[PDB]
Design a protein around this nucleic acid. Structure first.
Ligand SMILES: [Cl-]
Ligand SMILES: [Cl-]
Ligand SMILES: [Cl-]
Ligand SMILES: [Cl-]
Ligand SMILES: [Cl-]
Ligand SMILES: [Cl-]
Lengths: 119, 119, 119, 119, 119, 119
DNA sequence: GCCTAGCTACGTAGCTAGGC
DNA sequence: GCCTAGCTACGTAGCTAGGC
DNA sequence: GCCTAGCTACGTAGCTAGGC
DNA sequence: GCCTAGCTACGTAGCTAGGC
DNA sequence: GCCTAGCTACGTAGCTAGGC
DNA sequence: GCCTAGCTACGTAGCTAGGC
């Protein structure tokens, strides 16, 4: 129900966003500063293939309104590795831990979280 | 400390974002849906002139990464009118009341709030 | 077995060259004079529709190697009219009568007959 | 009275078509097939210089309405050689012998003879 | 021996510069000021037709190295009129009288006389 | 009061035309022949620096209305050398000696002197 | 109305394949 | 009026510097 | 009328020859 | 050598005249 | 490295102002 | 080999439809 980023052409149609309990490993970050001309995003998804137990972490970032750059990190069957990478990126960019996201608190000079719409 | 939108060229340098108690009348909204190609913003600011007790509500919206369209509604000394307009726009676009923003809860098909950075 | 001129787009696929006894009403004329820069053709076909007893005379002429101009004269069920038109054109251009074509003799300043190939 | 092909710029004004008894060594061939898109010519002339007893065979061929390609075969004073070349080309292209041209009969897939106009 | 200005296309080949005693009615004036960007000429010729007693005054002026503008004043048989016009132009432009040209003295802000070469 | 040629960009603003008694070492020559298409100038100036006893001879020549070509000959403190060069150029081009310029007489095929305007 | 991605409805340089 | 040097009032190819 | 070879009535890039 | 008028050695848009 | 706003470093059509 | 119809493999002006 949370869609694989359509820009991840290697995995779209072939994989789904990883879910565990209440955790959906899918997040859009955004940092907007009107004075300093900051207006950028960072998407992070932990993807599992539809066909087998094979994980990867997809990251895409850019100036808002651009495709920017991206990176797909292969993790094989190693879920823990993929969760570390996911969680560490989230922490690098927000200074909040992923498991504390219910109490997320924006830090100055780091990205905010943005809740996306799903169909 | 929260800057007047630089796109509001009529008021920038001449006015400040209105503050009262803990209320800063300045908000950035964002709605992003990857499936349906939604990627838009809506900024709302309640502005008070630096020189006198004169209020206006500034609104700017668009596809993210664009200047889009805008509207500056003059409210004279009528603060209540400006607060109504501000609060009603916020409610139209988020389905949350402005005074309940500490407990903001994103509604499907409406905009999320985004916390901006200030200098 | 003698093909309808492919340039006769109104009748091609829908009609055939008219035959009676040994008469095939299909002829290519050519007049070539190297000194006077004459190098032209004149095709005449008497066509009968495949679907019904309906006749027409198709004529196409030009500088050799060009589509030139043409004319399709509708004759309805009147075969005699179509034969007159056919035969009169042949006579105007060769000074030989159509029924004397076995003994055709080229007249100076008139067209020669040219035997085409059929598949 | 039968003109040297004007395209034979080496011999025109300097030579004439060779004649002997009733034989005029000058012929235009044409092959036209509307279905198979054949529409070509082949001219053959046996030329004798005006100044001396010197013969050549001129050949020009092409898509009708084009200059195509050509070949002038020098035969010196050897008339017999020039007659052989002339007659052999005629036979290759029509499957009729030159001396039987009064009874010429078009062969399917070979060229017809065309009588030209002279001034 | 003093040539009619070649730019006087109406009179060149048909007329000569007028002479009387030691007077040759032909003069080139020049005013050059390096500071004020003045660099202009004024030619005056009194012309008599070769064919008859018919006079005109030809004047041509411009920035040096340009054809500039000109004027040909018809004087009929009236020599005196032509001499007045000639002499008055000379005086307007040099502040010297024509008959005093042996003692010519350049006046500041007026043209100098320039002696041309003749063939 | 006689200006340094403005085209002498190395010396203009920094030097003056050399004067001694009644001698101003500054002259414009002009040769105009309407028949032979001669219309050229030659300027000669003997320049002394404003700052010190240092002389040079500046020459500029061309088709009238053009910057043409030029040459600045350095003479150091040697005034005599500069006077020789000046006077010799004048003589080469006019066939009159510089010291006889009060009685200047134009020679056929050599340049005339032209009196310039000063401010 | 605003805007623009991307599509539509052309044009064409020069390749290619078929006649000669 | 003529003429044209050189200036004015644009346009732009592609470099460069700053966000990401 | 149709068509187009080739001609007419231009324009111009840059060479060349003559002044300086 | 410098410079440039004007000439040379092209190219071409579209007119025109002759075949059909 | 990526990208592009906007700037830099030109070129120029045609206006304008000053000589004639 | 020659030639060229017509096709292929582009490019693009500006329309259009969908987000805002
Ligand atoms: Cl074919
Ligand atoms: Cl910036
Ligand atoms: Cl010359
Ligand atoms: Cl013709
Ligand atoms: Cl000026
Ligand atoms: Cl869409």
């Amino acid at each position: 129900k949370a869609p694989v980023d359509p820009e991840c052409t290697a995995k779209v149609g072939k994989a789904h966003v990883y879910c565990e309990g209440n955790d959906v490993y899918d997040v859009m970050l955004n940092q907007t500063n009107l004075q300093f001309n900051n207006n950028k995003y960072y998407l992070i998804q932990l993807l599992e293939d539809d066909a087998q137990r094979n994980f990867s972490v997809w990251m895409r970032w850019g100036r808002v309104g651009k495709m920017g750059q991206h990176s797909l990190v292969a993790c094989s069957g190693n879920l823990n590795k993929a969760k570390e990478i996911f969680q560490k990126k989230f922490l690098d960019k927000t200074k909040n831990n992923w498991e504390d996201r219910e109490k997320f608190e924006k830090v100055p000079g780091k990205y905010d979280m943005l809740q996306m719409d799903y169909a």
